[PDB]
Ligand binder design. Sequence first.
Ligand SMILES: *[C@@H]1O[C@H](CO)[C@@H](O)[C@H](O)[C@H]1NC(C)=O
Ligand SMILES: *[C@@H]1O[C@H](CO)[C@@H](O)[C@H](O)[C@H]1NC(C)=O
Ligand SMILES: *[C@@H]1O[C@H](CO)[C@@H](O)[C@H](O)[C@H]1NC(C)=O
Ligand SMILES: *[C@@H]1O[C@H](CO)[C@H](O)[C@H](O)[C@H]1NC(C)=O
Ligand SMILES: *[C@@H]1O[C@H](CO)[C@H](O)[C@H](O)[C@H]1NC(C)=O
Ligand SMILES: *[C@@H]1O[C@H](CO)[C@H](O)[C@H](O)[C@H]1NC(C)=O
Lengths: 446, 441, 442
Amino acid sequence: VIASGRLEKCVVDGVTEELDCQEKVVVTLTVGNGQSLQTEALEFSLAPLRVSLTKSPLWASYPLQYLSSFNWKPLEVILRPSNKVCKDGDWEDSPTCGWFSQRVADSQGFCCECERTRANLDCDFWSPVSAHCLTFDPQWYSGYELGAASLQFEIAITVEVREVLHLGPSVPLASSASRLLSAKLLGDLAMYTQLPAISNQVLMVPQPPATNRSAWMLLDKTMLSMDGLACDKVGTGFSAFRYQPSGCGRAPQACLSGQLKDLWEADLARIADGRVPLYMITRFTGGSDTTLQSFSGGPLSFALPVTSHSQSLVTLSVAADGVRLVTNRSPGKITGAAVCRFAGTSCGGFEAVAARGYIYVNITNTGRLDSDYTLTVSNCSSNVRPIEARTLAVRAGSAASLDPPMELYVEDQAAAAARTCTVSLYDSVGAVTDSLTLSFYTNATQ
Amino acid sequence: VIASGRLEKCVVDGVTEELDCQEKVVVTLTVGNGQSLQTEALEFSLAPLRVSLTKSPLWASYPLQYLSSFNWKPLEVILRPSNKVCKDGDWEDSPTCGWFSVRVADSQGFCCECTRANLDCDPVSAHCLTFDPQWYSGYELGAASLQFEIAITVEVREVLHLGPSVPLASSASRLLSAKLLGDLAMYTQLPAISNQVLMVPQPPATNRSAWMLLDKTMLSMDGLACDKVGTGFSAFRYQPSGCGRAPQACLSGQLKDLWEADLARIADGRVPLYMITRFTGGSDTTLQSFSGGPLSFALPVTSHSQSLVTLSVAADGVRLVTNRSPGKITGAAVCRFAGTSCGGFEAVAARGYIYVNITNTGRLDSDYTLTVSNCSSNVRPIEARTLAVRAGSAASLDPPMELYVEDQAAAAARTCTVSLYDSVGAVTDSLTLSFYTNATQ
Amino acid sequence: VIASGRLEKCVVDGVTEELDCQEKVVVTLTVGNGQSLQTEALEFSAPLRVSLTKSPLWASYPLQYLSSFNWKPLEVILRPSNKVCKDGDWEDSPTCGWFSQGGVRVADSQGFCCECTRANLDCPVSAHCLTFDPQWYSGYELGAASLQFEIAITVEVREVLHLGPSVPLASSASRLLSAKLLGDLAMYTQLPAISNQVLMVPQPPATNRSAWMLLDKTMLSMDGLACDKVGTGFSAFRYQPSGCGRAPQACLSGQLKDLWEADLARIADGRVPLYMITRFTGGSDTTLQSFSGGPLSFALPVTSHSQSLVTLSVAADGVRLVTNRSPGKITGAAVCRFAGTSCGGFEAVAARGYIYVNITNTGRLDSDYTLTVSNCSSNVRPIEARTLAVRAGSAASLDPPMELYVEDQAAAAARTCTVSLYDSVGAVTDSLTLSFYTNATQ
Ligand SMILES: *[C@@H]1O[C@H](CO)[C@@H](O)[C@H](O)[C@H]1NC(C)=O
Ligand SMILES: *[C@@H]1O[C@H](CO)[C@@H](O)[C@H](O)[C@H]1NC(C)=O
Ligand SMILES: *[C@@H]1O[C@H](CO)[C@@H](O)[C@H](O)[C@H]1NC(C)=O
Ligand SMILES: *[C@@H]1O[C@H](CO)[C@H](O)[C@H](O)[C@H]1NC(C)=O
Ligand SMILES: *[C@@H]1O[C@H](CO)[C@H](O)[C@H](O)[C@H]1NC(C)=O
Ligand SMILES: *[C@@H]1O[C@H](CO)[C@H](O)[C@H](O)[C@H]1NC(C)=O
């Protein structure tokens, strides 16, 4: 809650010209990112009017715009005619490879005469030409250019006298009313940790025919041959495969590296070495795809869960005169805390600089009331990148955890086994419990 | 308005050391993006002091920094010597193509004997790089800075403006001193253009219409790569195949090819990828309204950015007076980029543009809120809009509301509820109907 | 200060179920980016003196190591004299000799031979070998910026109790007073788009962060398959398009050294560098050195306003605001090129000016000041105001200078701006800067 007060709100009617003045109670208040429970309420004297606010989980949705389709892994098929006649040139009546149709330009591959190299392979003692044709993997992906992030949430105002009524201000519905009470969402304050710079990257969704969004990849424009003219880029086509620099003096599948498959396989290898993948959309979550699945949007939508604080400003205008704030102050306990690698490869520590840790913390509301809690990773040892605090609305008696874990970074590529952090837990002003995490960080390799 | 109150503001003078305490009325209040009219006012009791705030149209300006010049469409020119002698190599003083000037490296082009070489068989030929007369200057865009101005009209016939803005965070007028704290975060973030290269045609059409904004991936800055906006003499000569490649082989994907490809996108009811009009929705007129100089670039801000202004008045007592004029939605349509057609768009591969005409059906200039809510399945939510409309007069959303679908499904009965609110309650609502023909490819 | 008021704050205990209501004074206030000094204070009724200060704001970007990169790979041309150059794969004794990095023979490290630009020089054979500069660099992919600061809330009864709410510690308390940092408002000038670029730190073994570069992903061959990029290998150097028909160092352009040198040439022509991390500051590396983080950290000083919202809850009933209002004087103002190449002006559009302003607190009290560059001539890009907390009698300056831009590539020598200095509401002095802009070349 920002500040309460009394003000005479006058309304000069647009048609009648008559002004109607009524003294109202104008209360501006803060609604946190993780304020998903009925912890606090406001009581207005008019019998008291109980008003309580809750904010849905915040999401940063990016609009999709289809660009082109990209194949999972194109392949070179070396055809040896046996009749020793290969003629695959431009404006050719009948090439060995044959034209690809949706006649696609430069889809006829190339001929080569006499690791080994396209030409060197043709040289058989027993036999002297061969065609090199581009073929596509049965699986295709569709490339979508992500747009600008827009914060998607919903604020639920539960007005009660008796009979209860729910008001829903949000981003598309900034204002809401119910005769005695009219509330307006002004907007929220800036996030301390900005969103990832993914507002221009290309999202790779597999064209149908394991989990919804698990196979998805997000690629930088630097790794894509959009025109299909560059070599060894996601989208290298027939025009790039044919006309490649050396051609016959290069090993087969030469211009076919750096494809979706290759990048996917490379990312698996990164996860295996306890390093964060570079292309898999799970790089933002921390390993699990389940976090993203919880998003409300349609099949072709992309949104990341927001972990940074975004305090929404809501102004309430009540005809009632007098206000009181009532808040639940239930104690808590940290029922576990561990620093683990990407996708829970291992625990206890990570690789300095070349990788990052993920702080998973289990907490428990040790009371009879549903209360809001604040988890802080402070008083850390040398060269540890500070982590922004977290809010947790936890139900009475029940236990909770940070679904997207807190990312952990080190500002030195040093080898260590005794690195520490102080995991504090606060409830509605004062600290209820604290533990001391211990992370190891095996020095950066290369 | 955030919250009003009374506080004793004491000032310990820096030279005299004497403290001067005066009880003042401290009022913090928002100022919306589209609050360009005198709708609401504040009355302070000291005869009432009428104070009213307005915010100019918001713009996100990006600073320009010249990098290099880029040609419109470099062309390959094929010369057949007839004397059957092609002289084009490094150190050779009289090449067939001739050096470009002093002597630019690899400008001599290249030779092909017996696609380029296949054509010669009718016998050597010379392939020379030539440039289009039109050139464009490349400017690297910097970081966006929100540009606006808040006008505070203090009145007790005597009216006094006060202009707090981004370069002038504070303002005063003896009895009243106001400070712009800053505005809240936009719900829809700005487009990621803070590093792209702006292509302005070098002089010697409309002001900013010919302009293009290109990603750094589509520019060969060193002029060594092929088929990029910046590829030069050194790239044309030394191309992968060379003679075995068709004429105009290294010269694809230039400013002309990108512009041409973009007009084709608009034609197929798809948003262009390079034209600066991709942010507006078709019209260049929206951008022309920007205050800046010839070499400036700014995009109109459509997301809400509620500015926080704190007023300190020596007067004791405050009242808020607001105009509540009704409105009417005098039209609503979902149309393609640059008004190609209306009624619908192409699912995912394109986007719709909601154009809404409204009318202030009253005697007072009032603020209105337009919302596109209660939409059908897989429709991407659209953030609300504010409209300060003069009495009796009609208005429209100049930059239209962008419309997206979260499925590449073929549909003809897609719906949205366009509600119009005036200073708390809904005065009218319509029901838009969009068709989305499924994504092709 | 936003708004003060009185409210009954009730606490329903989670275990005892008993509600405890206490009427408190709830004050929401604003702490500026450059509010480092004790200028203003709050007096709660013997008065309780409470004063807020905000540390210098920084935008830190998390590092993630990608790969290592050499300073300037060099081509060493060897002419064997015995006229025998045989450098191919699987040959045990090549002229260049194999490179060993993992105790094993690195592929394509043998270079290439040329008979009778690389072959024109020989005029009968020669070897072309790739060698590395002793200096190596480490490529780190920058992550998303996170604002790093600390708010210090001094409480005085007697006893000096100092509270520290910040980004990792949003809340703080001290029995009578409990404060919460809600968050700060959005910056008018957004941060530079560096959240995806690759930071080049030289591998150890002149100044900490001076040699550092920040490169766009377009300028690196990560797979090492492209020619003339920051990352082109032995493999890229060999198998190059022409080879023997191209001048030495043909596939070794645009390396770290090459870019660095190009940037010194830009600074020399009074233009802002494109790769040097000093492009954000204004020339000096000293500004960045002041950052609290570890050796492998990167943060830029925030010059745009970021007003933090802090709400104070005191059991005391009654509040008064006391502020120091010391006058000031602009003791110099100049528009200078990057890294102070020259002064008086800059190059229109192709470059930018840097407004350096010296100010002086001409009073007995430490006070907060506002510096504004307003009422400027035609086609001058507006500059956001600055806050300065200056100690009594002492002089101060804008450490990161105000960037100056022109919205026309016109030649002008009489361009003007009105530099105004405000102190805790009213303007105490004003000068009139005069910049020259020599028109854009090319
Ligand atoms: C948290 O609890 C889950 C079960 O809910 C358990 O599997 C996990 O090991 C716990 N982690 C920590 C850090 O306590
Ligand atoms: C809005 O009104 C203009 C004329 O004022 C008209 O050209 C346009 O078609 C109208 N559009 C809608 C959606 O009503
Ligand atoms: C500011 O003062 C320093 C010395 O304190 C001097 O070196 C510098 O040139 C001055 N600059 C201006 C613009 O007054
Ligand atoms: C990281 O360091 C710890 C230190 O106890 C362990 O030894 C662990 O095995 C190290 N990891 C690697 C991959 O060497
Ligand atoms: C989009 O679908 C609607 C469905 O009624 C129309 O038939 C329209 O013609 C379609 N557009 C195209 C280009 O096929
Ligand atoms: C910039 O223009 C002014 C105009 O008076 C000066 O002549 C100055 O010498 C110019 N700079 C250059 C490099 O020509």
